[PDB]
Amino acid sequence: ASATRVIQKLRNWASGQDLQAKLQLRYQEIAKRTQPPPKLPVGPSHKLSNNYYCTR
Amino acid sequence: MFFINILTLLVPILIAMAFLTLVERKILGYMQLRKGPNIVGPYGILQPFADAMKLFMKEPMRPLTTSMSLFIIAPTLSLTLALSLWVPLPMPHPLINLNLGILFILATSSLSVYSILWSGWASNSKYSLFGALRAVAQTISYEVTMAIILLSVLLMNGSYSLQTLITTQEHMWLLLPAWPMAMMWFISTLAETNRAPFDLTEGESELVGFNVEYAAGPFALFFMAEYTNIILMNALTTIIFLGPLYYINLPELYSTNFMMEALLLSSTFLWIRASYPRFRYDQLMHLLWKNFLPLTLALCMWHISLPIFTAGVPPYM
């Protein structure tokens, strides 16, 4: 991006595609770092009852 | 003064040779989403000089099994013929104008095929000999159509002297007429400089042949030769088919436009390289002998007929 319109137009044409819509270089669209803290889910078998291993 | 002129033609051309290499390593880069060499020097300007010095310093290796002359004659011949062919070129004024100028360029090019043959025999390793034999064949084949394409041109120019075309192309480029051959001159110029679409002479994936046993100084000289040629042949396209505007009062606008057209067509074979896969050895000869030679021989006859029945026989001299 950050390309003068004319270069973009030349780009889009020479390529035959609207390459601007889907640029390869990433700009402020990528997930920000330090995404929020994760509280992951505990799966089955964590029941404190009727959880006999012999049955699983 | 003549020497001054000798220096003015060779030194600048050689420097241009060097920077073509840099330009080849940046235009190919940006096409492939990469900056190319910019860290050594400012914007990579010192990059060509840097590896030249690395190449000359590294030990030249003479294979145990190698001739020691057909080995050192080969790069000397390659650089000598290529730099020599810039001697008789109209820009617009030629350093040594020769009445049979285009025959000089055709003959001098033809001699370079030996360097490939001599280097391949000299190396005495299988990869080199196989590469040289196919290579000589490519180069020679692309000479037969290369020559006929010029003969068609000359017959519409009236003479073999490259200086005449500046007067032939005072109203229109010879591309408009004869475009069908330009294309065929351009493709043949791509073969004779062993550039990409036709780089089987020295395929890398195929036989990593011409410089297999050549490193350091010998590598460089051919190397230099190839790139100077890359320019020269492009420059011949820019005189024979794309005729730069000539004004007798100011001779440099001829050279200014010669500069512009040569750089763009030199840029084109750089652009061709990155854009196309390399042709097969027989696919390459299939093109010249089947696709192009019948087109060229017939269009050759059309260029002996166009003059006569259009009462346009060109003025000798």
């Binding site: - | 002129n5 820009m91 320019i231 500069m259 040569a262």
Partner: protein
């Protein structure tokens, strides 16, 4: 950005115009401000030589009606 390729091209170009301007002014200096005569055919060499004999030793010097 592509403009970085330009520095290299410029240096190539400057080095491809020098030759054409150089050869075409080291001629107009050595030949006395007049383009070096191109003697394609003998007649021209004759006329050229004739000129030499006509004045000095160099053909570029050119005598006129006042001689």
């Amino acid at each position: 950005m592509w403009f970085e390729i330009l520095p290299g091209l410029a240096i190539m170009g400057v080095c491809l115009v020098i030759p054409g301007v150089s050869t075409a002014y080291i001629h107009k200096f050595t030949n006395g401000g007049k383009e070096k005569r191109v003697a394609r055919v003998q007649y021209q060499w004759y006329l050229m030589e004739r000129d030499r004999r006509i004045s000095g030793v160099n053909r570029y010097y050119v005598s006129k009606g006042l001689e």
